[PDB]
């Protein structure tokens, strides 16, 4: 009566939502409108419809609504929680370190990966004290307003030079940061031209870019 029933009830529950999905792209057809600038409000309700409904995807009605009201709020509520922990790590965290911290504090109603990303993607466009950021590598980071990587490329340089050359795990221990970011810092520095690379089994060493001095 359970082993069974549960299945029956499911499809019923599903037919129902199936209906929900049909007349929601329909509501997307009922947006022929042409322009787009200062935020609107008819749409606001539509999104919260789709979020509640797991069809959360104006993946084609983007220029018909941004992200979300809930996500805008969540972003704010995030900027509060993340200030401190950002600070104690040099103003930069990995998205997944965040996902880990934020979700580890709450025992329940945890954030979905997308919630977090969505929340963060509009952090910037809310003049908030911290910013999302993506690297060449596709690695996603949260960093403080105050803090700025390109000022950090200057000091990476010295520390490299003081040490001759460093790999990322090496640099990681010296600045005391995460291997993933040390790597990105050294890679950024190589980008801007302060660093050059020595790749081999020994590992991927970064040396100061001498090709630009001595010639």
């Amino acid at each position: 009566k359970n082993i069974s029933e549960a299945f029956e009830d499911l499809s019923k529950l599903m037919i129902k939502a199936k209906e929900m999905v049909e007349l929601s792209k329909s509501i997307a057809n009922k947006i022929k409108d042409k322009q787009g600038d200062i935020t609107e409000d008819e749409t606001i309700r539509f999104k919260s419809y789709l979020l509640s409904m797991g069809i959360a995807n104006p993946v084609t009605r983007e220029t018909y609504g941004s992200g979300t009201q809930y996500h805008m709020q969540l972003a704010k509520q995030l900027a509060g929680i993340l200030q401190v922990p950002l600070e104690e790590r040099g103003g930069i965290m990995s998205l997944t370190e965040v996902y880990c911290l934020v979700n580890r504090a709450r025992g329940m109603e945890l954030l979905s990966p997308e919630d977090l990303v969505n929340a963060c993607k509009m952090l910037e466009a809310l003049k908030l004290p911290l910013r999302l950021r993506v690297f060449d590598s596709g690695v996603m980071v949260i960093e403080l307003q105050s803090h700025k990587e390109e000022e950090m490329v200057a000091s990476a340089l010295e520390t490299v030079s003081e040490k001759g050359s460093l790999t990322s795990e090496e640099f990681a221990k010296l600045v005391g940061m995460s291997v993933l970011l040390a790597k990105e810092r050294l890679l950024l520095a190589e980008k801007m031209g302060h660093l050059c690379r020595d790749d081999s089994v020994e590992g991927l060493r970064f040396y100061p870019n001498l090709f630009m001095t001595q010639s």
Binding site: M14, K18, M20, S52, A56, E109, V139, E202
Partner: protein
């Protein structure tokens, strides 16, 4: 404003379903799979937001999202051992270990579901097909067709050999060498100069240790 009404009707529909079958999406694995499979054919994502109905109502999101954090932790606590690459099997035993021998049962299937969502976070997690199963990757690193292939060869024994590579792949020594060089450079393999016929290259992600996972956490 149309569906607005029909929506809180659906809440009720779900809420009623919820109280009658919450525990079933815990006691029963094929049940969650069944559930999630159905949502898909429609075009709804029960894991896309903890602020979705299925989530709040069915506790499915907090199931998966907590699972995700747990996948992240064990992969971290073992990165040092296996360079950030781990079999979905080892990964499954450790997740259970962490979850206590007082129930909460999880399946390889769940692990995947969770991993595929952790990709939303950007670069880090990947799933890689080896042999029958998968390798779960948690530190971003390359994964050529060429690297993967050699991963496959190492499945059975936990190690691989320049000879073994050339013999099946028909490569020339150079192609084998760089591949192996990449793996050593990324922490994914370890040179061994005391095996019988030549240098063996062991990948700790294959190779069944597992013995106690302590202190590095």
């Amino acid at each position: 404003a149309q569906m607005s009404k029909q929506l809180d009707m659906f809440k009720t529909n779900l809420e009623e379903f919820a109280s009658k079958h919450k525990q079933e999406i815990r006691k029963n694995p094929e049940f969650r799979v069944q559930f999630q499979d159905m949502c898909a054919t429609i075009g709804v994502d029960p894991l896309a937001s903890g602020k979705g109905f299925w989530s709040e109502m069915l506790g499915v999101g907090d199931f998966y999202y907590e699972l995700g954090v747990q996948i992240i932790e064990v992969c971290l606590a073992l990165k040092h051992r296996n360079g950030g690459l781990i079999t979905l099997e080892e990964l499954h035993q450790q997740v259970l270990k962490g979850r206590g021998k007082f129930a909460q049962d999880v399946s390889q299937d769940d692990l995947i579901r969770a991993i595929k969502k952790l990709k939303a976070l950007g670069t880090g997690f990947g799933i890689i097909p080896v042999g029958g199963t998968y390798l779960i990757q948690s530190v971003p690193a390359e994964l050529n067709m060429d690297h993967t292939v050699v991963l496959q060869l190492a499945e059975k024994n936990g190690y691989v050999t320049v000879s073994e590579i050339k013999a099946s792949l028909k490569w020339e020594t150079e192609r084998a060498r760089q591949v192996l060089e990449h793996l050593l450079k990324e922490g994914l393999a370890w040179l061994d100069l005391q095996a019988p016929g030549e240098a063996h290259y062991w990948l700790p992600a294959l190779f069944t240790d597992l013995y106690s996972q302590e202190i590095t956490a």
